[PDB]
Design an enzyme around this catalytic site. Structure first.
Site, short mmCIF file in Angstrom:
data_model
loop_
_atom_site.label_atom_id
_atom_site.label_comp_id
_atom_site.label_asym_id
_atom_site.label_seq_id
_atom_site.Cartn_x
_atom_site.Cartn_y
_atom_site.Cartn_z
CB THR A 69 -0.94 0.06 1.22
OG1 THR A 69 -1.82 -1.07 1.20
CG2 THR A 69 -1.74 1.34 1.22
CE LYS B 214 -4.71 0.14 -1.42
NZ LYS B 214 -3.26 -0.14 -1.56
N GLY C 248 -2.81 -0.97 6.06
CA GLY C 248 -2.73 -2.00 7.08
C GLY C 248 -3.66 -3.17 6.75
CB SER D 171 4.24 -1.78 1.72
OG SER D 171 3.24 -1.61 0.73
CB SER E 1 2.05 0.09 -3.90
OG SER E 1 2.65 0.18 -2.63
O1 LIG Z 1 -3.74 -5.31 1.32
C1 LIG Z 1 -3.86 -5.12 2.50
N1 LIG Z 1 -4.29 -3.92 3.00
C2 LIG Z 1 -4.62 -2.77 2.14
C3 LIG Z 1 -5.75 -3.03 1.13
C4 LIG Z 1 -6.94 -2.12 1.46
C5 LIG Z 1 -6.62 -1.51 2.81
C6 LIG Z 1 -5.12 -1.56 2.95
C7 LIG Z 1 -3.52 -6.23 3.46
C8 LIG Z 1 -2.01 -6.52 3.37
C9 LIG Z 1 -1.40 -7.54 4.31
C10 LIG Z 1 -2.00 -7.57 5.72
C11 LIG Z 1 -2.15 -8.99 6.30
O2 LIG Z 1 -2.15 -8.93 7.70
C12 LIG Z 1 -3.26 -9.45 8.29
C13 LIG Z 1 -3.26 -9.60 9.68
C14 LIG Z 1 -4.40 -10.13 10.28
C15 LIG Z 1 -5.49 -10.51 9.52
C16 LIG Z 1 -5.46 -10.36 8.13
C17 LIG Z 1 -4.34 -9.82 7.53
C18 LIG Z 1 -6.60 -10.76 7.30
C19 LIG Z 1 -6.40 -11.67 6.01
N2 LIG Z 1 -5.67 -12.93 6.19
C20 LIG Z 1 -4.46 -13.06 7.03
C21 LIG Z 1 -3.76 -14.28 6.40
C22 LIG Z 1 -4.95 -15.16 6.04
C23 LIG Z 1 -5.97 -14.13 5.60
O3 LIG Z 1 -6.91 -14.30 4.84
C24 LIG Z 1 -5.78 -10.86 4.84
O4 LIG Z 1 -4.69 -11.10 4.37
N3 LIG Z 1 -6.53 -9.86 4.30
C25 LIG Z 1 -6.01 -9.10 3.18
C26 LIG Z 1 -7.20 -8.74 2.32
C27 LIG Z 1 -8.06 -9.99 2.17
N4 LIG Z 1 -8.95 -9.88 1.05
C28 LIG Z 1 -10.32 -9.48 1.47
C29 LIG Z 1 -11.29 -9.49 0.30
O5 LIG Z 1 -10.59 -9.31 -0.89
C30 LIG Z 1 -9.57 -8.36 -0.81
C31 LIG Z 1 -8.45 -8.88 0.10
C32 LIG Z 1 -5.35 -7.81 3.71
O6 LIG Z 1 -5.82 -7.19 4.65
N5 LIG Z 1 -4.24 -7.40 3.08
#
Ligand SMILES: O=C(NC1CCCC1)[C@@H]1CCCCOc2cccc(c2)C[C@H](N2CCCC2=O)C(=O)N[C@@H](CCN2CCOCC2)C(=O)N1
Lengths: 221, 253, 242, 233, 210, 247, 246
Positions: free
Chosen positions: A1, A33, A47, A129, A169
């Protein structure tokens, strides 16, 4: 990001890329975002995606409730207080790094909020990031009293630095300009990334190529 | 039932007589307060008088301690008229409400919202049978976020509103007539005022209004005057000497 | 403060509960609600209380309510108390589905809501609910069902019954005219007859009639809340048949 | 107090079956300044009488017409403190729904939740009923709505209605000249005319508040000048 | 991580012109390599315009489906209308987040029609979730499950905009089958539901059973 | 009355709370307490004339004067148990203030807190309001004397000299003749004994010793609480008694 | 982070660097570690940013409550009738930055509203309630604070609230943060009792400059707050570089 914001003449400008990742895979290529808190307050989020979505929704709705009950223009300081107290309450386990910006009686304001609950009032900042690349660009080129067009160009350049130098990103560039009287959410603003090669003809499977075992048709209403 | 005038329940005609009796209890204190709004300031004037209660006024009473004006915050003060226990209780409720607001939201509550939150507190007493009503009516002043003065008044029924000028006391129809005359007389002038001129005129209007209402010659030692303005946004009383000078000017005119 | 207590849940010198008797008086003072079972489904009909010609009479049923897909109720008594208990019974049906992965039998739902009412009559110091329910539904265990509840938490099954004002006339009409194997049309016409005769008239008026029924057809249980047009059609058929 | 033995119903059944406290709250409403709402073809209007006791009071400080959310407005006839409490609760429930489902609360859902809250105060121990009636107007996907909520917690769906002082005569006046195919301007004129026929004397832009929701737009409280224009004719 | 490998499974959503399709594998794994069932559908009908695909831990799949059915039924009986697909999607996000720190180990997708009432227009609606309720609104396709990478490759390569119902069926079925053939812990059958405003077509594919 | 005086939470139709007035009557019937500001201290006196027929009570065992932080005098007229309750609350507030801030609670803040505590027992239909009025006072070189009296209704006022309880009017008439801000506490002792001999007709020169509690905060005691020693109260008692018997 | 307090003859001076870092990365170049609690009561923050920020916000709320409870009833002071300025511009002059940014506010001065100190909370009281808050949760909270202020009882004061929630009053100077270790002996050697405003200002500025020179965790610019009995003065110094003859 990569999210970033800066202060310019009587305006706050926010910018963000649009990639969401699930590990090394791009899960969403055009995620939003930039979040509407109020007509004069927006925020950009980096995050954990779920934490950001739900924290910004809670903040937006509580801010609207406060505005209705007091009939006054929402303050950026109120968003800072509420958000920081919540995040501190969760000791950083709500991973929300937020650039909060808005315009109120105290003029244009911009805050960098961190998941553990700290906040800082700044003329510019970047988070995520890609924040180091965007901060390189902003540190190189930021100036006081920029015009809105100059601020938009700089925000776009910073987000593009993040997009092209950080693997986490990518996608398009989204921007919002927040003034005293209104905001302007432009989505997409840049669109620097597209698919280059296309096959000369899209594969169309002939009808009946897939073998089936059973089929039932059920009509509706 | 036989107890429809004992609890906060509707009587056959729809009245809640406990609210009326609490208001009458406020009226029985024989204390008069007047608030007046200017263009860039606001004033409250009250008698430095012990509320008519069971005990009387002794000559060993410290009359400087007698007051009905309090600070809620640095920038918001009020007059609380009514039963002194209830008035102190409402003062503390308002102070805690303001402090909670500040901590929660990171900026000071303005007078209007504080009045409305107080009245939301009072409504609970009006609806729950096991709590007595607070026999207390108040006036709250402050400078809002657009550098405009505010004047708000609440009473035991939980009803509040903003005012150009207001009076708490035994008589209020005739006080309203006096205040309306004073306000129109002040308004009919077209010459523009300075900040200091506006503050002086507002304070003189408040003193003259309280005097024309109470129908005797106010002594500077027996009244209190508090002001908030855009020059000094802090809610501050003025000295007995300045009150005396305003009184000498009023008398000689 | 005990001097203000009205002692709602206290036996009377004749082993009676006065608040419950008064709630029953209030229910008896409400508009007629009828119900009857055919071989094609459960019919619920009700007379609407006139307030003004400005009420919005479109898709506004105020005496018959859907509890679940296979259950629906008619109300006689205080409408706000009824709204509370209807919300509760919808919750109960969905809770049974959550816990057991199958729809709730009608008698179990009636028992749960009647338990709520009885509890208000036994515990606490609050007044009882001033509502009587006509609950009808379908389930595989007991087929088409129809129940009647009162403020005391009592209930009982019926093949046809009426609650609210002038239930005596409607009940006598049902006793004379209800048969053991009726079709949906015959049931609807009989419901219209008993509604008309309880409201002191001969030809009923569509503006004052709520009619709904509940059928298990082709395996699906389906509820039909007749509009003013469908009721007008049935009124024409009734005036033909009588 | 609020717990223990001192929590018993203050509203109880009479021999005839009536809950007299609700009747008395209704009387209190019937003695209050009139309010009314009108459902027009492409909008819904709520209007009220706001008669200033004295020249000293600030009219803007008192609004009897409030917004609950975008597209939903509310007016009341009865006790103002009760109204403040219920308006705060309505805003809270609107945002709770909005947080769960993202979108705006449907008017019917809000009305049902608020009616249940009102009903609780006619049964729970140690309290009196609310002494007011509410008119709730709004626009959602399912059209325009105008609902009334009574002190007992019953709610009604209206094409047009009036609550408060001499509302029977106002109701006859309003039903003599209401059709379901009116326009926003005609509805506002009708509301003003109804209030004039009720109010004793001469009405003005300071004696009335008006709120509109029309043509799929956010709820709006007409300013003094707009009402003045509506009153020019 | 390994919790999701315990059972296996995946789900896939795709939209065409006035049509949308949802597909899933049919295996119930145990201990990551033992197939105990071949009729364990991950697709659930909330209402005629709203389907949900739930991959992940089977116990959590069933539990979450029951919670969602409870919530939808209560909402629809109270409102006397069918729940809009977007309201349902937001509700699912809120339910998943309410367990933010001890979450349901599920990888949901939502597929259905967003109705734009003028006549009525039926706009395909697709959303993919993570286990704490983060949402990805899309127009072409959504994927979830342990087979996510293979489904992403197949969809990015083969998806074609604005296909009719037959083209949509062939495309989604080919994407699912090719992706499943590379997964050790998914497959053993595929169900494909193709939705139109008028009818639903349910198909079982003659898929690999190893 | 008329049924409106059975609860402290019901206003009468004329706006009065009758239970509070009945408490006031109870307090005015109870023993006398007074506090007086002098030039170099404050002096407090309790006259326990209601116990004149209690001959077997241990001499000088019943004392109504307490202190908070060794520098604040707190006394009362009214029910002993309620007064002890309020004094416990005062000390608890002082402890909490020190814990939070590491300085002693200022007198006026403590008075406000005590008055709010008392007022809270006049608000509900299931709590008996306190039947006692409280005197709270201190003295230091820079500020001179501070005397507050808290009423059962919860109203606190500031005085230069206060008398509560029985015969308070006559005591006030005697007290108001002289400006004690220019008299020393020791000299005020004899005046107080004379006032007791005159005003309380149940008190004579025989039971003056065992029926009167004397305490002060003054320069002699380093501005900290102290019960006046009998070696100071004796000459003053004898002088007041002889002077009175002269006339 | 470097935070310093020094008591001089007519007041107490508080100084700080402005760098906030997360590892080797500087997340905030110019934070604001000296925060006003009351008009005459400031605190210098050290430690984890979130911890000190949320603690200070709570303490500000507590201070408002205390101040408004300290207000006595009535009127007072019906008669009571109630130094060489630092050449900040010359301290901040640099050859290569002359009018490069003309618009630059490097100073501010304000007077106390509570002129007689009638209701302002005592410095000691606020410091001790802060110590209480930190101690009650010293299993989680990691932040060290310096309180400086003026009250009519003890005059200008310094209170160090150390990690783990202990409080020590200082009567000469107080230092905290990773940078102060480097200037410990420098300050010890150069401090004397009853310093003038000018001497104290120069000393505190040089202390911060040396600490920034030696500590990577310190840097940015220097904020100096001077608290007297009647007014508060604040300065920003941007000429922080240190020139050694050798
Ligand atoms: O890009 C991201 N942030 C930006 C994008 C928009 C706002 C800012 C982050 C980048 C990395 C962060 C990962 O740290 C976590 C810590 C705790 C919980 C979870 C993640 C939850 C989950 N986890 C963890 C591993 C298994 C799983 O599933 C996971 O990775 N969530 C993905 C998005 C998931 N999808 C939802 C629907 O489709 C879009 C993406 C996610 O939060 N990424």
């Amino acid at each position: 990001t990569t999210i970033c914001g800066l202060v310019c003449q009587n305006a706050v400008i926010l910018g963000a890329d649009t990639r969401a990742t699930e590990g090394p895979i791009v899960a969403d290529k055009n995620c939003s975002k930039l979040h509407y808190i109020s007509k004069n307050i927006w925020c950009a989020g980096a995050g954990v995606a779920g934490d950001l979505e739900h924290t910004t929704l809670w903040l937006q709705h509580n801010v609207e409730l406060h505005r209705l009950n007091t009939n006054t223009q929402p303050r950026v300081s109120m968003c800072v207080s509420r958000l920081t107290q919540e995040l501190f309450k969760y000791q950083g386990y709500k991973v929300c790094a937020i650039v909060l910006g808005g315009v109120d009686v105290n003029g244009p304001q911009l805050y960098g909020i961190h998941p553990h609950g700290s906040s800082c009032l700044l003329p510019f900042t970047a988070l995520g990031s890609g924040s180091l690349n965007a901060m390189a660009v902003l540190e190189a080129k930021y100036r006081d009293n920029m015009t809105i067009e100059e601020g938009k160009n700089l925000v776009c350049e910073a987000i593009c630095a993040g997009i092209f130098n950080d693997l986490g990103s990518g996608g398009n560039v989204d921007i919002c300009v927040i003034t005293k009287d209104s905001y302007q959410h432009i989505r997409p603003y840049k669109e620097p990334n597209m698919r280059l090669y296309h096959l000369p003809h899209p594969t169309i499977y002939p009808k009946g190529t897939t073998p089936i075992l059973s089929e039932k048709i059920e009509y509706i209403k | 039932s036989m107890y429809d005038r004992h609890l906060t329940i509707f009587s056959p005609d729809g009245n809640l007589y406990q609210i009326e009796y609490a208001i009458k209890a406020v009226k029985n204190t024989n204390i008069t307060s007047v608030g007046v709004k200017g263009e860039n300031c606001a004033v409250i004037i009250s008698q430095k008088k012990m509320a008519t209660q069971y005990i009387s006024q002794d000559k060993l009473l410290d009359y400087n301690n007698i007051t009905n004006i309090y600070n809620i915050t640095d920038e918001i003060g009020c007059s609380m008229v009514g039963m002194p226990g209830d008035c102190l209780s409402m003062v503390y409720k308002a102070r805690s409400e303001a402090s909670e607001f500040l901590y929660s939201n990171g900026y000071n509550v303005n007078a209007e919202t504080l009045c409305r939150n107080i009245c939301d507190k009072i409504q609970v007493y009006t609806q729950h049978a096991y709590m007595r009503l607070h026999a207390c009516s108040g006036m709250i002043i402050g400078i809002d976020e657009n550098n405009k003065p505010e004047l708000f008044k609440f009473d035991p029924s939980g009803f509040c509103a903003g005012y150009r000028a207001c009076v708490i006391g035994n008589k209020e129809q005739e006080s309203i007539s006096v205040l309306e005359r004073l306000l129109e007389k002040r308004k009919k002038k077209i010459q523009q005022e300075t900040i200091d001129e506006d503050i002086r005129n507002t304070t003189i209007l408040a003193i003259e209004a309280l005097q024309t209402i109470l129908a005797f010659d106010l002594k500077a030692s027996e009244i209190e005057v508090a002001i908030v303005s855009t020059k000094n946004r802090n809610f501050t009383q003025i000295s007995e000497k300045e009150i005396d000078n305003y009184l000498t000017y009023i008398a000689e005119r | 403060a005990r001097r203000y207590d009205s002692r709602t849940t206290t036996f009377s010198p004749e082993g009676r509960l006065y608040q419950v008797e008064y709630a029953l008086e209030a229910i008896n003072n409400a508009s007629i609600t009828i119900g009857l079972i055919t071989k094609d489904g459960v019919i619920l009909g009700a007379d609407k209380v006139f307030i003004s010609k400005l009420i919005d009479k479109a898709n506004n049923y105020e005496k018959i309510y859907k509890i679940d897909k296979h259950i629906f109720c008619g109300v006689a008594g205080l409408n706000a108390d009824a709204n509370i208990l209807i919300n509760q019974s919808r919750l109960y049906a969905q809770r049974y589905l959550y816990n057991y992965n199958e729809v709730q039998p009608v008698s179990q739902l009636v028992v749960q809501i009647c338990d709520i009412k009885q509890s208000y009559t036994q515990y606490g110091g609050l007044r009882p609910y001033g509502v009587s329910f006509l609950i009808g539904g379908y389930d595989t265990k007991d087929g088409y069902q129809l129940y009647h509840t009162d403020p005391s938490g009592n209930y009982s099954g019926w093949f046809a019954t009426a609650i609210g004002t002038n239930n005596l006339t409607a009940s006598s009409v049902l006793k004379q005219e209800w048969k053991n194997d009726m079709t949906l049309e015959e049931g609807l016409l009989l419901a219209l007859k008993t509604l008309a005769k309880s409201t002191d008239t001969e030809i009923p008026k569509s503006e004052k009639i709520e009619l709904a029924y509940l059928t298990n057809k082709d395996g699906e249980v389906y509820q039909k809340y007749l509009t003013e047009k469908e009721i007008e059609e049935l009124i024409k058929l009734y005036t033909q048949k009588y | 107090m609020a717990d223990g033995e001192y929590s018993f119903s203050l509203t109880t059944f009479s021999p005839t079956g009536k809950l007299v406290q609700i009747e008395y709250a209704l009387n209190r409403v019937s003695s209050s300044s009139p309010a009314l709402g009108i459902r027009a073809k492409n909008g819904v209007i709520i209007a009220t009488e706001k008669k200033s006791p004295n020249e000293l009071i600030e009219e803007n400080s008192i609004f009897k017409i409030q917004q609950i959310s975008e597209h939903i407005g509310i007016v009341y006839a009865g006790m103002p403190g009760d109204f403040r409490v219920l308006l705060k609760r309505a805003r809270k429930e609107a945002i709770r729904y909005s947080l769960q489902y993202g979108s705006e609360i449907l008017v019917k859902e809000l009305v049902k939740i608020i009616a249940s809250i009102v009903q609780e105060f006619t049964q729970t121990g140690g309290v009196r009923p609310f002494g007011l009636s509410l008119l709730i107007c709004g626009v959602d996907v399912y059209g325009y709505h105008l609902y009334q909520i009574d002190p007992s917690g019953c709610y009604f769906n209206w094409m047009a209605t009036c609550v408060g002082k001499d509302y029977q005569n106002n109701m006859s006046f309003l039903e003599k000249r209401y059709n379901k195919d009116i326009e926003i301007e005609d509805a506002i004129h009708t509301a003003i005319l109804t209030l004039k026929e009720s109010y004793e004397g001469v009405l003005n832009e300071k004696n009335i508040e008006i709120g509109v929701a029309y043509d799929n737009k956010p709820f709006k409280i007409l300013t003094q000048n707009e009402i003045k224009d509506y009153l020019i004719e | 991580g390994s919790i999701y490998n315990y059972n296996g499974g995946c789900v896939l959503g795709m939209s065409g012109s006035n049509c949308v399709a949802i597909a899933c594998d049919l295996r119930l794994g145990a201990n990551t390599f033992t197939t105990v069932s071949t009729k364990f559908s991950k697709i659930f009908k909330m209402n005629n315009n709203v389907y949900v695909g739930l991959s992940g831990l089977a116990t959590d799949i069933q539990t979450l489906y029951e919670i969602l059915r409870y919530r939808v039924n209560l909402y629809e009986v109270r409102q006397d209308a069918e729940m809009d697909v977007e309201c349902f999607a937001n509700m699912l996000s809120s339910i998943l987040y309410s367990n933010r720190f001890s979450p349901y180990f599920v990888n949901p997708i939502v597929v259905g029609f967003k109705l734009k009432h003028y006549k009525v227009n039926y706009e395909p609606y697709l959303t993919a979730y993570d286990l704490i309720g983060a949402k990805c609104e899309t127009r072409d396709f959504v994927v979830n499950g342990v087979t996510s990478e293979q489904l992403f490759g197949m969809c990015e390569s083969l998806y074609v905009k604005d296909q009719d119902e037959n083209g949509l069926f062939e495309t989604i079925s080919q994407c699912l089958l090719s992706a499943l053939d590379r997964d050790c812990i998914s497959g053993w059958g595929a169900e494909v539901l193709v939705l139109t405003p008028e009818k639903i077509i349910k198909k079982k594919l003659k898929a690999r059973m190893d | 009355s008329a049924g409106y005086d059975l609860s402290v939470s019901t206003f009468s139709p004329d706006g009065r709370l009758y239970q509070v007035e009945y408490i006031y009557k109870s307090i005015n019937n109870n023993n006398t307490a007074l506090c007086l500001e002098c030039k170099d201290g404050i002096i407090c006196c309790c006259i326990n004339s209601n116990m004149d027929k209690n001959k077997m009570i241990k001499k000088n065992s019943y004392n109504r004067i307490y202190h908070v932080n060794n520098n604040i005098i707190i006394t009362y007229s009214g029910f002993d148990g309620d007064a002890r309750n309020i004094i416990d609350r005062a000390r608890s507030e002082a402890n909490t203030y020190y814990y939070n801030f590491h300085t002693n609670i200022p007198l006026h803040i403590l008075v406000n807190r005590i008055s709010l505590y008392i007022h809270a027992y006049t608000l509900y239909w299931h709590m008996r309001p306190f039947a006692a009025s409280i005197i709270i006072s201190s003295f230091n070189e820079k500020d001179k004397g501070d005397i507050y009296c808290i009423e059962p209704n919860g109203a606190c006022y500031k005085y230069s000299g206060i008398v509560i309880g029985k015969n308070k009017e006559m005591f006030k008439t005697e007290i108001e003749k002289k400006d004690y801000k220019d008299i020393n506490v020791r000299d005020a002792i004899e005046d107080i004994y004379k006032f007791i001999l005159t005003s309380d007709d149940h008190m004579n020169k025989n039971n003056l010793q065992n029926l009167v509690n004397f305490s002060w905060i003054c320069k002699e005691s380093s501005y900290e609480f102290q019960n006046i020693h009998e070696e100071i109260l004796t000459p003053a008692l004898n002088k007041a008694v002889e002077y009175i018997e002269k006339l | 982070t470097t935070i310093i307090g020094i008591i001089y003859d007519n007041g107490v001076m508080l100084a700080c660097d402005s760098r906030t870092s997360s590892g080797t990365f500087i997340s905030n170049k110019c934070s604001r570690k000296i925060n006003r609690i009351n008009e005459n009561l400031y605190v210098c923050r050290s430690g984890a940013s979130a911890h000190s920020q949320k603690i200070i916000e709570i303490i500000k709320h507590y201070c408002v409550s205390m101040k408004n409870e300290n207000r006595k009833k009535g009127r007072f002071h019906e008669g009571e009738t109630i130094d060489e300025e630092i050449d900040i511009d010359s301290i901040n002059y640099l050859d290569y930055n002359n009018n490069n940014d003309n618009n630059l506010v490097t100073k501010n001065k304000y007077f106390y509203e509570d002129k007689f100190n009638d209701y302002n909370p005592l410095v000691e009281n606020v410091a001790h309630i802060t110590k209480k808050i930190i101690y009650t949760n010293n299993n989680f909270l990691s932040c060290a604070l310096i309180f400086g202020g003026y009250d009519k009882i003890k005059k200008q004061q310094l209170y160090a609230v150390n990690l783990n929630g202990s409080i020590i009053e200082k009567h000469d100077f107080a230092v905290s943060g990773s940078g102060s270790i480097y200037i410990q002996s420098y300050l010890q050697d150069k401090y004397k009792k009853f310093m003038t405003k000018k001497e104290c200002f120069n000393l505190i500025l040089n202390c911060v400059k040396y600490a920034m020179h030696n500590d990577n965790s310190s840097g940015g610019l220097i904020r100096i707050v001077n608290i007297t009995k009647s007014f508060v003065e604040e300065f920003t110094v941007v000429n922080t570089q240190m020139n050694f003859q050798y």
